[model samples]
Target: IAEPTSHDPDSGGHFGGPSGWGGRYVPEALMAVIEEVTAAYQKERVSQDFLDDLDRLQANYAGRPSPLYEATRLSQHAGSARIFLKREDLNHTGSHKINNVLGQALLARRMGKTRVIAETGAGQHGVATATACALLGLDCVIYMGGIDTARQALNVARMRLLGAEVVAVQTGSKTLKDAINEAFRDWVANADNTYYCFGTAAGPHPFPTMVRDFQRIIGMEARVQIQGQAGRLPDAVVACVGGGSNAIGIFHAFLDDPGVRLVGFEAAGDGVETGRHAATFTAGSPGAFHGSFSYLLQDEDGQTIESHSISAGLDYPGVGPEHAWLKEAGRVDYRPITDSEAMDAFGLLCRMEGIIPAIESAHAVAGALKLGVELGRGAVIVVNLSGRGDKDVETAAKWFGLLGN
Candidate 1:
């Protein structure tokens, strides 16, 4: 197995991340289950044995310490400044999603749960969870939008091959939201012996915080490695924001480093002005979607406006509550990147660095260019190369007219 590209041990504290944000918004039936896992997380996260096991899994199984690569050729457009990539794409399972899944899978077993249920979009999270479950001898069921299952059929096969049961959700828009709805149903019905494994650092209280604890490894490793490689801190850190897991994962360690500017790029589908985009942080308002109150795309009547993105993973109407908190706290800057811009960067990186990035990660590459232009010469930038493009070759080949009918 290849190495993973990417924990925070935190006390069970509310309103710590996005102050005044994130609480359980589920119904009465699920509270006991939520509280059960929350209590376990609070205690186990800080336990030395738990930490030791996670460390071993990360190093031996998931491949830890994913390298920081200098994109020298790709930095020419940035003028006098250089660009670096924290290569999460090289990790096992080909994305940073593996980091959280391994941790959560262990947590589920520790809680005496023998089965895990999860919701997925783009199929990355589902595949990661399935891989972990297969490794740990836990039963796994993954809920995915019917549309997503069709588009990402290979990932569906990967999950099934790993012995997971894939449930195609045919509800609402037949997308991620629908899949989430189905997952919650299963969670409520099987709360006794099943653990609801969330895919991102979103949803209700303990989840946003809990997932962050598992993902902080990215930034923690990058913080030390970047300094060792560059001999100094970067001027800015860039990442693409979908539900903000990878973004927050890379941003957490630098939260206290005020000098290091943090920036996130959201998919600007056709364009935000066209009202066809997933630029949630750029144009969304504070609203509840899924299980938490955060910035969401909504119609005049508060009905969720379906979001569009060339990147399936980023095509969502809501962002993680912690991202909303970070934006409000002025700790990070969020911007929108058009599909054309992202595709252009995607091509550039492929030709220059020989690195084919996930379409979602391409958004960060686009943002890095914008930052390089705005920040001017002598500024150093680090981008989270969040995932590889193995799952996106067909999409990219078609978009660039490199495919045959």
Candidate 2:
């Protein structure tokens, strides 16, 4: 992986993912365009120039080739499945979000831009963006949901300490969706001077295309690591879906690999049927939300409503455009993990592996557990752990009785 630099001049600057992105609600022509663009991007990614870029990411960007750890207790001959974790928490910013932010911020600098801004839910992306901006000498602003800002005050302060301004959005439900709407408004208003550092694989054309390219190193590395360690690519690749950025980042590299299976887990507050969850891909219908065409949780009249989840970052009603496409095409298996299930996995991983994963990533752990049961001992699964649990400690201590009673 090349150090996250500005968009590379070689390879035409893009990444790849699944082909079919449209539903009966979206035009087939639009889906075809998505497939065409993504296919072209992947086809052109094999140049020597791109290889140099990967090196920079590993060395300078310090991608450190995130570890591929075998989950001993998590796997433990339960059903014969072998499960491993692509431990991204060891990355500089404690999540896979850094990979994209490094590249985007560099691109913003290369474009001669003076400022970069973005919206964040869990604030992991904001931290990574601020880290990049601070390193590269670019002014940065982060628009975060007021609710998230309150819950994740420490992260907000971390970005401020890094010299990035933080704005607490006060609109709609004051969550990711609201923050995103606020962010888009800010971008359209300040497009000339500020680059909107979008944090997901779902968004307008260039974003869904570009961010994935920046972060693909996660999967690219995992592909080689898993193959080297397991002697072959795992039968399944699992990751959580919050804005679907991390999942797509890892999933894109495996899309064309015939034997690899893709599984995305959406946050289910209590359950999907309760109508109080953020399992967008599984429960949502094709509709426009968050400045893009994708699946969204909407009302009977198509009015977009907010979503809920135990994970603050996953509490958005819509997913990235590419995920919507993957679902329609049946290239990826999607499901939901309730809050209790996620929390259980969170505690289990912390105790068993001495690794506290971000609440978002715990969804993937929960999914992997189910997938392990299905595959039963002979199957191997690799999970993308998108971030660490440091930011959610306060919430966790209270909910899990980890705090003084």
Candidate 3:
């Protein structure tokens, strides 16, 4: 691959990133509110007061500098490659979602928005937003797919307990995409007082840029921790990709490190060939989806094909624009991990390491296992354990036949 002039992938600015993948494509009515957010973000992101408040909250409330634990038992299973896990699962709300939510909620407060709205698939983002809103005294309303609400009942209850109203969206496939559609409708009508806390780093213009900025802390800490622990950079950095926030969060700091390999594992529900999977880059075409232009699974008529994944968080037809750009630039390698493959890794982590990882994170574990074998012994790998598996126990129990049908 040819080296680009700028090591930072998002240096291309608001119109689009260096890859020309991100841009504003929302409805005309939303332009003013979007611009308002853009101006506020540009101003606040640099303000020392804003930065201090966010840092305080992150360190005291959301739990910053999440540990980088070397998974010795898990490493033995992965061809003895030294496996270090960046434990975002230890963050407040049991996921990395808190990082972005706290920042956005503070931004919402700064923007004088009294209400915050968001959409979620796995409910991690929703729960995180609710928690932040409760702490910051902002009214929160989360849009979740009806199916997701059913599967992630634990998080749904958590959201409500945190004082946020959760609306179960029942449109189009009843998944994350539909939930976003509903949230967008609500935001358009209530833009004056509502701030949309976009869950992932996908959307249009400033969203992909802004969300990534909030999440970059993951990689920033991990890079230093791994070097301190191992005395060298890891051979590879692995993560799961949905709207690609967690992956990008942990990948951004390593972008300038030419020798560090960045790998993203997309959920392949069954297998890519089964025509029932969420592996976008493996089986999708470049198209505009949910605001930004990126790779999406579309039919011959250009309609999005419903994506299926055992992991709710990864069940999306599209990915963040920067991921598309990275793939095109050959800066990061993207691969697919089938549902079965991910589950096996999930089971392995629980039994071998006494850690129950979210199914979304298991995809990265699965990929790391394969990568470890390729790199052989002594190779170092850092996997972003994005969230805990507490919310997924029911689904996993049923999957393993521990629950009676």
Candidate 4:
């Protein structure tokens, strides 16, 4: 089997990389630390250092303990099962992306690096990186695909307003992959002066672990709240996946809880069979993209290709490495949600709950709606609303016919 391009100890699976995981070009530090935070892919699971890092970052920096609300109205409306929503949407920076961004930015600062660099889709991470950098007085630069730059121009403006430079990456279909390529090249060129702030937990060693550590607070807080209020852990937990940071954050807490079923929903833009979806676990092949090995939507030759979603944030070719591990271990049930189903859920949440969720979070909502049906009346379903809708309002409004015609 080929080795991976990069592997984080926190996210195991080193047998093969999406890009033909070869142990070639391994970093000296990564190789030196066999039992450390940076482990080679295909090695054992993450070290204890990973758990410690996440614990520290969550309490001190990320301002976690986000609310988990019982969806009273929706629960009653569903009639079959009680439903709850983990309000990660109310988090700072408009989404759960901040948790990972802040932690990585702090890591960059502590390493004595002068700056941070990242790639963004839908400009969420760009805004997030800029937020962290401005607060910490660190320089931030974000590379965005040319097409995405045009589509999310307002967010591009928001990043600049927050004091981060946004570079337009124009190559290879003008999407997330191109932007990632530009960011990697920048990191290779400026590794001494800059830290690559990957938005999700799917990159080389240190990153998958690093990003998840930043994001795991979502699960930690929810776990405690659910146990205290409901008198036990949830019957089922749900989260949406882009690069899988949010899902990992929430799922990690329950990985050992055999009684609690975890579900991860990926975006199936139209349908997986159509070969036009971002539903990595369903529509993709195992390939490397943006630094880790996972199922990735690809072409006939297995080249990473552009992905589709009603939500720009979830439009990625591959998922985080940890998700791959989860799927393989049978720890979490993985599934897909089409664009139409997501929009349908987005509308339901707003009407029934008086809340608008991010376009991406709608994927989880969509999944929960289905899970609610199968779980029957006595069961409980909690969907993690990973973000708000303001960022996607303009586009989503059009999709839902909310725009004044």
TM-score of each predicted structure versus truth: 0.94, 0.85, 0.94, 0.86
lDDT, candidate 3, equals 0.89
Q: For residues 4-28, what per-residue lDDT tens digits would candidate 4 score against the true structure? A: 2232342333523433331123334
lDDT of 2 by residue, 260-343 (tens): 999999998989889899988778887766446678889899997768898877887888777776777778988999999899
Q: At residue 260, what lDDT does model 3 achieve?
A: 96
Give the candidate order by descending lDDT. Answer: 3, 1, 2, 4
As a whole number from 0 to 100, the lDDT of residue 7 in candidate 3 is: 32
lDDT of 1 by residue, 1-405 (tens): 112222221233334342355656667777788889889987887788888898899999888988999898876777656788999999999999999898899999999999999988878889999999999999999999999899888889999999999999887789877888888889888998999998888877688877877878899899998898789988999999998899999998888888999999999999999998999988888887767778889888999888899998888888887887788778899999999999999999999999999999999999998898888876889999999998888899999999878
What stretches of model 2 exceed 4 Å from their correct place? 1-58, 170-178
Q: Over all chains combined, what TM-score does candidate 1 have? A: 0.94
TM-score head-to-head 1 vs 2, winner: 1
User: Model 2 Cα RMSD, Å?
Assistant: 5.7
TM-score of 2: 0.85
Global lDDT scores for all candidate models: 0.86, 0.77, 0.89, 0.75
